[PDB]
């Protein structure tokens, strides 16, 4: 109950922590945390605004030691991908991880799929799927006023 309440408090304060992030600090599994989360929402007759890709960009990039320009590019890429519906049904955390990977690979500070998955709580396979979905539209997703250490046409393909 306490872990689910902590998750709900983060969502209500507008700095959501993923269920995996809460589980990493709670002995309670993510499954039970989600069960208690839904039960608490029903009991309190309250609601939490749907999370977005930009809700985790700051934390993920800061934990990855990525520059502010890289963080901005990742946020723009994720928001543009969601707007264009390039990743329909994909989890916002997975989309954010894929966008962070794209921006990091396009910037000098390059972070591996394993690293991004470790910080974001998303498997490298899921990051690969999302990055494959968003890769074709990389030049459109990237911000107009962005400096590419590695040209967009030479981004990793996989």
């Amino acid at each position: 109950i306490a872990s689910a309440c902590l998750y709900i408090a983060c969502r209500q304060e507008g700095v959501p922590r993923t269920f995996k992030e809460i589980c990493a600090v709670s002995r309670i599994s993510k499954k039970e945390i989600g069960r208690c989360f839904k039960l608490i929402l029903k009991a309190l007759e309250t609601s939490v605004d749907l999370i977005t890709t930009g809700d985790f960009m700051s934390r993920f990039c800061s934990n990855l030691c990525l520059p502010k320009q890289v963080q901005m590019a990742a946020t723009h890429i994720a928001r543009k991908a969601v707007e264009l519906d390039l990743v329909p049904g994909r989890s916002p955390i997975s989309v954010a991880a894929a966008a962070i990977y794209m921006a990091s690979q396009a910037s000098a500070e390059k972070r591996t799929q394993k690293e991004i998955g470790d910080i974001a709580g998303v498997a490298d396979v899921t990051i690969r799927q999302s990055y494959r979905l968003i890769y074709p539209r990389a030049p459109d997703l990237f911000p107009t006023d962005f400096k590419f250490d590695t040209p967009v046409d030479k981004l990793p393909q996989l």
């Binding site: 993923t18 269920f19 989600g34 989360f37 839904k38 929402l41 609601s47 749907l50 999370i51 519906d85 329909p88 049904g89 994909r90 989890s91 916002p92 955390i93």
Partner: protein
């Protein structure tokens, strides 16, 4: 609307009115499996109706997998007759359908974000826990799983009319949230 939900699973409960020996039923029945350590019931399966029935020592049985009410009742009767042939005084008492599950497609993508924003009081959308959106219809007590692909799954219905009414109620909302 032009789309009718198709019943994918029907769950029913019946009472045989007689205490049963699960070990004997497992030993004699053709397709029965019993594992008291795992579960306290006996799981039997039949092909032509394509259904699985759990039989309890108290005499009550629960049949699932049937795609229609007639098929569910026929499969339950078959299981009861098998138990009777095994030497027990099995009967067919107070047969009832406890839950009905249906599936359908709206043939267009749906914006779950807008749907949940407009129907927060009924919609729970947690992609982390489940990609689909859980809509709890009120007037019919039906839970619907709506997916971005357009697939809609209705569950919790006791009668087919409930499934059809719930889908009819939800269809215009999904049309308004067409992507």
């Amino acid at each position: 609307s032009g789309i009718v939900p198709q019943l994918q699973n029907i769950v029913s409960t019946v009472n045989l009115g007689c205490k049963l020996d699960l070990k004997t039923i497992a030993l004699r029945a053709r397709n029965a499996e019993y594992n008291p350590k795992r579960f306290a019931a006996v799981i039997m399966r039949i092909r032509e109706p394509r259904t699985t029935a759990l039989i309890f020592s108290s005499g009550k049985m629960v049949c699932t997998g049937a795609k229609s009410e007639e098929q569910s009742r026929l499969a339950a009767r078959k299981y009861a007759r098998v138990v009777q042939k095994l030497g027990f005084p099995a009967k067919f008492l107070d047969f009832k359908i406890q839950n009905m599950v249906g599936s359908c497609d709206v043939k267009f993508p749906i914006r779950l974000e807008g749907l949940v924003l407009t129907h927060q009081q009924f919609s729970s959308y947690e992609p982390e826990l489940f990609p689909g959106l859980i809509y709890r219809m009120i007037k019919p007590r039906i839970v619907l799983l709506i997916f971005v692909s357009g697939k809609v799954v209705l569950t919790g219905a006791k009668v087919r009319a409930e499934i059809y009414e719930a889908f009819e109620n939800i269809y215009p909302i999904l049309k308004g949230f067409r992507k």
